[PDB]
Chain A
C-alpha cells in the first residue's frame, strides 16, 4: 500500500467530554466529512492496520545442492509411470516411459510436424486433455490477466534448439526445457513430483554428463554426484517374507481376547 494512505488529513482527536469516541476526527468544515474519524484502522477513510510494505521478504533462497536433489527426484519420477499417471498425464498408449525421440525433432520448424509427432508417440491424448481442461478461472484473478487456465501437458527436453521450440509452441500444454538448463518449477509443477516427459536422444544422453553416474562426478556441474539412497531395497514386501527375517520372529499372536 502507499505510505500516505490514510494520513492525508489533519485529524485531531476531539478530547473526551464532548460525548463521542476519542478518535482523531476530521478537523473542520461543512462537508459531510467533518469529524468522521480518521487514521484508525477501524475508521472509514482511516488507515489499514500494519500496512503492507515493499520491503517484506518476498524472495526466498535455497541451497544449490538441495535444488539439484529436487530436480533429480523429479527426473526420477518422470520415469515410474504410476506416478506420472497419478499426476494425471494421460500416458496409456505411450511406449517406454523415459520416452526418447530421434533428433530430427530438434529442427522441425512447423507445428504440424510437432503435432503429428505427438500423435505418433501417442502423447496427443495429454494435449487433447489440456484442451479439454481450458476453462475459466474463478475469482479476482480474472480481472488481473489470469483469466483462462488449463493443465500442464508433456514436457519436451531438447538438447539444442534447431527450430523445435517454435514448432512446439502453440500446442497447448507443452513446455520445452533445455537439458543443460533444467527447472523444477516446470519438471515438477505445483511441486508435484510426477511429470510426463519426452526426451530427445541428444538431451537424454547428456543427462549422465550433467548429473553424473553414482561412480563419476557430474563433469559439468563442477563437483557433484547424485545423492545416496538411505534404504536400498525399497520394496519391503520382498524383505518381510524373506527367509532370513521370517526365520527369526516370534509367531503372530492374533487370537483376540475380548
Chain B
C-alpha cells in the first residue's frame, strides 16, 4: 500500500501527471535498466537513457542481441530511436521505429562528469540501504 496522504493512486491524476509531465521529469520517466554486467559493476539498477548510450532491445519485433547506439530521444513522444531499429516506408526512405526506454537495456553508458557522479550517488544510497538493513 501507500500511506503518505499527499500522493495519489488516482488513474486520472497519475495519467495527467505522466502525459503532461515536463521534459526534465520525463528524463526520469524514460529511464531504462542497465544490463547485468554493468549492474554488477556500478551497483545501480537503472539510468535515465541518453542520446548515445548503446542499447539492446528486449521486447517487440526488434527484440534482439544487436547492441545499437541510441540515436535520439524524443521526450515529447516518450520514445527512443536506435541505430538500426528502423523500417522502410512505402517510398523506400528509412524511418526509426520508436522504442520505449523501459523495453530496452543499456549495455554501454555515455559517461561524462555528471553521469559518473549520478551513478556514484545511486551506489552510495544503495549501500546505505544495505548497511541499514544489516
Contact = CB atoms under 8 A, between A and B. Distances in A.
Q: Taking the complex as a whole, does A directly touch B, i.e. does some CB pair lie under 8 Å apart?
A: yes
Interface of A: 143, 145, 147, 169
A147 B14 CA distance: 14
Contacts of B1: 169
B114 interface: no
B14 to A, nearest CB: 10
A50 B10 CA distance: 31
Interface in B1-54: 1, 9-11
A143 B14 CA distance: 13
A76 B6 CA distance: 41
A169 B1 CA distance: 8
Contacts of A169: 1
Interface residues of B, number: 4
Interface of B: 1, 9-11
Main secondary structure of the interface of A (DSSP, over half): loop
Kindly list the 3 A-B residue pairs having the minimum CB-CB distance in the complex, ordered from nearest.
Answer: A145-B10, A145-B9, A145-B11
Contacts of A145: 9-11
Contacts of A147: 11
A27 B1 CA distance: 54
6 contacts: A143-B11, A145-B9, A145-B10, A145-B11, A147-B11, A169-B1
A143 B9 CA distance: 12
A144 B11 CA distance: 8
A189 B36 CA distance: 46
A175 to B, nearest CB: 13
Nearest to A147: B11
A152 to B, nearest CB: 16
Of A145, A147, A169, chain B has the most CB atoms within 10 Å of the CB of: A145
B11 to A, nearest CB: 6
A258 to B, nearest CB: 68
Contacts of B10: 145
Of B1, B9, B10, B11, chain A has the most CB atoms within 10 Å of the CB of: B11
A176 to B, nearest CB: 13
B106 to A, nearest CB: 30
Contacts of B9: 145
A169 B9 CA distance: 18
A41 B43 CA distance: 65
A92 B11 CA distance: 39
A112 to B, nearest CB: 13
A146 to B, nearest CB: 10
A124 B1 CA distance: 21
A145 B12 CA distance: 9
Nearest to B12: A143
Nearest to B8: A145
A145 B9 CA distance: 7
A170 B9 CA distance: 17
